[PDB]
Amino acid sequence: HTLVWGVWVNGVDQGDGRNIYIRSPPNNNPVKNLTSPDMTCNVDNRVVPKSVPVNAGDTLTFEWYHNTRDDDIIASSHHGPIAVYIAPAASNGQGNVWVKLFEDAYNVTNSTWAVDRLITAHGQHSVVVPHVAPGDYLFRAEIIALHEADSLYSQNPIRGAQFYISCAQITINSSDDSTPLPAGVPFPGAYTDSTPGIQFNIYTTPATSYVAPPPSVWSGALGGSIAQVGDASLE
Ligand SMILES: OC[C@H]1O[C@@H](O[C@H]2[C@H](O)[C@@H](O)[C@H](O[C@H]3[C@H](O)[C@@H](O)[C@H](O[C@H]4[C@H](O)[C@@H](O)[C@H](O)O[C@@H]4CO)O[C@@H]3CO)O[C@@H]2CO)[C@H](O)[C@@H](O)[C@@H]1O
Ligand SMILES: *[C@@H]1O[C@H](CO)[C@@H](O)[C@H](O)[C@H]1NC(C)=O
Ligand SMILES: [Cl-]
Ligand SMILES: [Cu+2]
Numbered sequence: 001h002t003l004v005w006g007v008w009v010n011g012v013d014q015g016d017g018r019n020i021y022i023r024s025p026p027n028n029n030p031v032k033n034l035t036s037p038d039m040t041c042n043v044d045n046r047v048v049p050k051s052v053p054v055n056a057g058d059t060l061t062f063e064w065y066h067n068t069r070d071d072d073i074i075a076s077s078h079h080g081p082i083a084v085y086i087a088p089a090a091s092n093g094q095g096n097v098w099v100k101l102f103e104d105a106y107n108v109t110n111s112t113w114a115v116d117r118l119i120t121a122h123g124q125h126s127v128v129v130p131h132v133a134p135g136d137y138l139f140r141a142e143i144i145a146l147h148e149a150d151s152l153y154s155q156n157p158i159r160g161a162q163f164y165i166s167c168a169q170i171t172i173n174s175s176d177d178s179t180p181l182p183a184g185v186p187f188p189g190a191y192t193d194s195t196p197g198i199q200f201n202i203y204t205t206p207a208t209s210y211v212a213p214p215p216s217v218w219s220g221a222l223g224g225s226i227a228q229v230g231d232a233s234l235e
Contacts (some may be wrong), residue, residue, distance in 0.1 A: 179220030
């Protein structure tokens with residue numbers, strides 16, 4: 001259980017974005033039905049009033065929280081990968097429009113899942129804004145918690161992979177558009193019961209054997225990181 005509070009741009013807090021520039025759900029309950037419109041931007045997908053200004057090469061940092069900002073972020077049990085996708089706001093998240101900018105499952109070195117490092121990062125994880133066409137975008141941050149992903153939701157609707165999905169409204173002003181955005185995947189649609197990384201037993205199988213759901217990170221992506229980039233306690 002976890003939600004996005006707001007974003008930082010180049011380490012500068014953009015302030016509370018909930019129902020302002022985040023298309024926020026009414027609570028932190030997971031999405032589990034892979035076929036549901038809820039897979040797009042969670043259970044309350046509607047244009048909210050603001051879109052955060054950024055330029056290509058900016059560092060955009062998502063800040064997640066559990067109950068209160070900068071609390072324990074998400075339950076330690078919710079081991080799993082973290083992905084970020086982008087779509088033209090034009091799409092409203094409909095059609096084959098979602099392009100992956102970031103994937104992080106398990107770091108063999110430190111033996112921590114992306115979710116583990118997010119808690120350590122005080123809920124902060126980032127992507128570098130790609131050189132797409134200036135315009136309005138949705139950035140879809142996705143945490144997959146696998147603490148019950150040994151089952152499928154479609155077979156046993158009280159278990160299954162859990163998706164914490166947050167769409168941010170981002171306006172890209174300055175960009176040379178050196179990497180125009182391709183068509184991407186649909187959500188709902190890209191994840192099915194068969195898709196690798198959806199059904200997996202973190203209790204019996206080693207985390208090094210884990211393979212995150214496709215698609216692969218777009219060649220136009222400029223990477224990203226899970227790490228604190230500023231102190232919410234001083235805001
Ligand atoms: O630990 C391995 C074990 O995990 C089992 O699943 C557990 C989870 O480990 C546990 O973290 C999870 O806790 C949930 C709880 O069910 C929710 O009701 C609660 O929701 C809260 C929310 O936290 C608050 O933020 C909000 O304000 O209120 C709601 C109350 O409605 O959130 C916590 C997580 O934060 O519970 C699971 C059991 O249901 C697996 O089942 C098992 O297979 C594993 O072995
Ligand atoms: C999953 O969502 C689809 C589409 O909204 C719906 O038809 C189906 O009833 C849902 N499954 C469950 C278990 O509710
Ligand atoms: Cl749970
Ligand atoms: Cu939870």
